[PDB]
Design a binder for this molecule. Structure first.
Ligand SMILES: *[C@@H]1O[C@H](CO)[C@@H](O)[C@H](O)[C@H]1NC(C)=O
Ligand SMILES: *[C@@H]1O[C@H](CO)[C@@H](O)[C@H](O)[C@H]1NC(C)=O
Ligand SMILES: *[C@@H]1O[C@H](CO)[C@@H](O)[C@H](O)[C@H]1NC(C)=O
Ligand SMILES: *[C@@H]1O[C@H](CO)[C@@H](O)[C@H](O)[C@H]1NC(C)=O
Ligand SMILES: *[C@@H]1O[C@H](CO)[C@@H](O)[C@H](O)[C@H]1NC(C)=O
Ligand SMILES: *[C@@H]1O[C@H](CO)[C@@H](O)[C@H](O)[C@H]1NC(C)=O
Lengths: 198, 596
């Protein structure tokens, strides 16, 4: 999806194996905020929010708590008290075509900054001046969503990057998204310390 | 809400769409240059028309924001750059006439073919047919024939066209609240609104005269030495007291004197510093040349080339089937896309050109953080000067020994430094009076100081006074002798070479003082010095956001262009020329004493 209309998938009631993601060599950014990757495979969470979008190479740094920019203010805002991981990888092979891929958009103007985890899909003309826009993109009245022009011959700061942000929250409901606990080979007829289902 | 925020949002909806349209146009121009085919020409023309129409619409929309209600200097600079009418203030008929005049001058210059009367079955074009004759022949009347016949055909075609051109450009400039077109060209160096660092359009001519008055003794001694050597080469044509004949300078117009190095060499018996054979023996590919240039730029601390540079550049001639422009050009296509289009051979000249164009690429990469309309040099001189300093540094024997191209037991004595400095003076110092005379003549033509019936009588008078070059035979007003050159016939500014030449040695002194070099300035190499690269990159990162005076304060610590670094660079050569000119007469006479 586009960054203005970022896809949110709610992940519940399953087993989340995070070591498959962490040990992959295909990811360029795996920056986790509020938690470390080593204890992800141990801890258990109530729900997982997977937000997916495409941004530029130079805009990956703005997907962080406390940052400022077009993406943070107008497209996708992260809270300061955010627990989760931001995973980004280059997708110049898929999301760039030789003619120019203009299927991706970004809200360039809004009257106020976004709240954390807010989605704005409105297509109303931004009013920068005192005169009413009246629905026409004339003087001082600009269209909010501006397209990205992805091409495969671009620089590394302009190449498309697919970003998946996983948000981990703990609520008073029973946490059901747990990691895969391993199973040490059962040994019989010896005095051993057993741990069966807790 | 406020006017300033409205202008900022307008500049952002400019910038974002502009970068992508400039990219499309630049990519179309690249595809034309690497593949000369008619559909690529059509795609280039369509992209250029879209780019020009988009610039017209944004110029039409930018003017509605008044300048005096904006206080931020960068926003005011971008709005000042955008709000220029250009040719749009002129009427559509006169604008179409001006465009037609420019196109027909382009066709006349590009397709101008001249050969000898009574032998018309085949003819030679300027490049490379006439260039090789001008650069290599030793015959007086053959060079005289080629020079007079090409200025006869080109001037007699272009004189009414230039007479229309000056009137149309003056009309456009006075419609844009300028005094003349010369003031429009001098407005590139105009700095307004900065306390102390302001620069005026009228100060440029005074600064050029002030620097050239100090240029003049060195050029007089060099001209006397070249006169004595050409008297040795041609016994009877050259007078001891007079100017040089025009067709003997080694090039078509007198732009460079670098083709007289064989005739005017001080010590022919001593060897040259030619490294061509060493690269041929070690089989140095053009890829290795660009990798060594990249090693030079990482040694000074500048960023290395992107992966897209190595993937997308054409550094070798494609073949017979595919046609490409042979001229080396660095392309900043936009959005972090940087390419070099050069048909690189295994020569010293192509290696220095590779360093020069990679310096252009480094300069383009440095201001990538800037907004789109501020992505330029602070003036037109800096952009070429940052490539010419790399051409200076790469040419040193220390750089050749460091990269292994020169033998470590090569003897660097004073005679090789003298003849190298003389070659650099014939390339660099010799273009300065021609450039100054051409720009001053064009400024007086646009200002109206010279009437149309008196253009050439003054012009040759200027050439005798400034360049010290006499016409072979007198020319009347049916000739148009300036417009045989590429830049003047195709509406290009010419003071960029003068400013580039002075900024080159100013930057060279600044970086060599930064690098703590303890010898002569021409023996200085800026490799291995992180602080010199940092001092360079501080100015390089600014782009057009800051005034060129403030950038020059950032580099050299001076608020104005200076002539003393050039004289310090050639000071051993200046003393050697003063020693060699004891018997001969320094200076020239403006009279017709050699030939007229
Ligand atoms: C250049 O244009 C010709 C025209 O047919 C085309 O066949 C060829 O593939 C092109 N080459 C490149 C490198 O674009
Ligand atoms: C001018 O505008 C730029 C953005 O266009 C901003 O970064 C800068 O801080 C502004 N300068 C001043 C003095 O307000
Ligand atoms: C451009 O031309 C228009 C129409 O003649 C004029 O109103 C405007 O002031 C001009 N712009 C400048 C910067 O002079
Ligand atoms: C540029 O330098 C960096 C760090 O020295 C290196 O990782 C990168 O591969 C270099 N780029 C190229 C194209 O070699
Ligand atoms: C070069 O040095 C030698 C030895 O010191 C000296 O004899 C000669 O005159 C010098 N030549 C020049 C041009 O300085
Ligand atoms: C600059 O550094 C490189 C890296 O070791 C070295 O090979 C080179 O010799 C140095 N330059 C000089 C002039 O010593």
């Amino acid at each position: 999806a586009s960054v203005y209309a970022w896809n949110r998938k709610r992940i519940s009631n399953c087993v989340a194996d995070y070591s498959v993601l962490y040990n992959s060599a295909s990811f360029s950014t795996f920056k986790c905020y509020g938690v470390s990757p080593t204890k992800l495979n141990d801890l258990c969470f109530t729900n997982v929010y997977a937000d997916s979008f495409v941004i530029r190479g130079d805009e990956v740094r703005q997907i962080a708590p406390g940052q400022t920019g077009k993406i943070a203010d107008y497209n996708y805002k992260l809270p300061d008290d955010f627990t989760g991981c931001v995973i980004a990888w280059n997708s110049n092979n898929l999301d760039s075509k030789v003619g120019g891929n203009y299927n991706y958009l970004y809200r360039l103007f809004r009257k106020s900054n976004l709240k954390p985890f807010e989605r704005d899909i409105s297509t109303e003309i931004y009013q920068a001046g005192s005169t009413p826009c009246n629905g026409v993109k004339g003087f001082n009245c600009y269209f909010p969503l501006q397209s990205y022009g992805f091409q495969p011959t671009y620089g590394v700061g302009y190449q498309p990057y697919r970003v998946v942000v996983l948000s981990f929250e703990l609520l008073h409901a029973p946490a059901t998204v747990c990691g895969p606990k391993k199973s040490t080979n059962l040994v019989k007829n010896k005095c051993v310390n057993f741990n069966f289902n807790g | 809400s406020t006017i300033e925020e409205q202008a900022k949002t307008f500049l952002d909806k400019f910038n974002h769409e502009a970068e992508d349209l400039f990219y499309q146009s630049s990519l179309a121009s690249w595809n034309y240059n690497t593949n000369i085919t008619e559909e690529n020409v059509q795609n280039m023309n369509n992209a250029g028309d879209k780019w020009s129409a988009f610039l017209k619409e944004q110029s039409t929309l930018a003017q509605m924001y008044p300048l005096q209600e904006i206080q931020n200097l960068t926003v005011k600079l971008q709005l000042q750059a955008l709000q220029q009418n250009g040719s749009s203030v002129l009427s559509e008929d006169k604008s179409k006439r001006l465009n037609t005049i420019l196109n027909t001058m382009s066709t006349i210059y590009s397709t101008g073919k001249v050969c000898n009367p009574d032998n018309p079955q085949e003819c030679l074009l300027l490049e490379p047919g006439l260039n090789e004759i001008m650069a290599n022949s030793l015959d007086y009347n053959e060079r005289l024939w080629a020079w007079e016949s090409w200025r006869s055909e080109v001037g007699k075609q272009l004189r009414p066209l230039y007479e229309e051109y000056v009137v149309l450009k003056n009309e456009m400039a006075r419609a844009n609240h300028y005094e003349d077109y010369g003031d429009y060209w001098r407005g590139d160096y105009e700095v307004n609104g900065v306390d102390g660092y302001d620069y005026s359009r009228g100060q440029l001519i005074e600064d050029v005269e002030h620097t050239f008055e100090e240029i003049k003794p060195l050029y007089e001694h060099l001209h006397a030495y070249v006169r004595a050597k050409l008297m040795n080469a041609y016994p009877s044509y050259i007078s001891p007291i007079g100017c040089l004949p025009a067709h003997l300078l080694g090039d078509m117009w007198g732009r460079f004197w670098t083709n007289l190095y064989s005739l005017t060499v001080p010590f022919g018996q001593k060897p040259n510093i030619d490294v061509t054979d060493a690269m041929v023996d070690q089989a140095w590919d053009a890829q290795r040349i660009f990798k060594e240039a990249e090693k030079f730029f990482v040694s000074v601390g500048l960023p290395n080339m992107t992966q897209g540079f190595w993937e997308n550049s054409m550094l070798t001639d494609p073949g017979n089937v595919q046609k490409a422009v042979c001229h080396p050009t660095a392309w900043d296509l936009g959005k972090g896309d940087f390419r070099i289009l050069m048909c690189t051979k295994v020569t010293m000249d192509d290696f220095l050109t590779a360093h020069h164009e990679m310096g252009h690429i480094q300069y383009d990469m440095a201001y990538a953080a800037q907004p789109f309309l501020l992505r330029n040099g602070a003036n037109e001189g800096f952009h070429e000067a940052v490539g010419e300093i790399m051409s200076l540094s790469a040419a040193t024997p220390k750089h050749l020994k460091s990269i292994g191209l020169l033998s470590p037991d090569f003897q660097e004595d004073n005679e090789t430094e003298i003849n190298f400095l003389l070659k650099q003076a014939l390339t660099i110092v010799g273009t300065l009076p021609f450039t100054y005379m051409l720009e001053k003549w064009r400024w007086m033509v646009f200002k109206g100081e010279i009437p149309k019936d008196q253009w050439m009588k003054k012009w040759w008078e200027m050439k005798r006074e400034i360049v010290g070059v006499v016409e072979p035979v007198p020319h009347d007003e049916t000739y148009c002798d300036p417009a045989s050159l590429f830049h003047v016939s195709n509406d290009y500014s010419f003071i960029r070479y003068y400013t580039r030449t002075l900024y080159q040695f100013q930057f060279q002194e600044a970086l060599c003082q930064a690098a703590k070099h303890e010898g002569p300035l021409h023996k200085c190499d800026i490799s291995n010095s992180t602080e010199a690269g940092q001092k360079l990159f501080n100015m390089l990162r600014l782009g057009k956001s800051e005034p060129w005076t403030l950038a020059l304060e950032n580099v050299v610590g001076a608020k104005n262009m200076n002539v003393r670094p050039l004289l310090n660079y050639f000071e051993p050569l200046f003393t050697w020329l003063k020693d060699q000119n004891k018997n001969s007469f320094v200076g020239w006479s403006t009279d017709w004493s050699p030939y007229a």
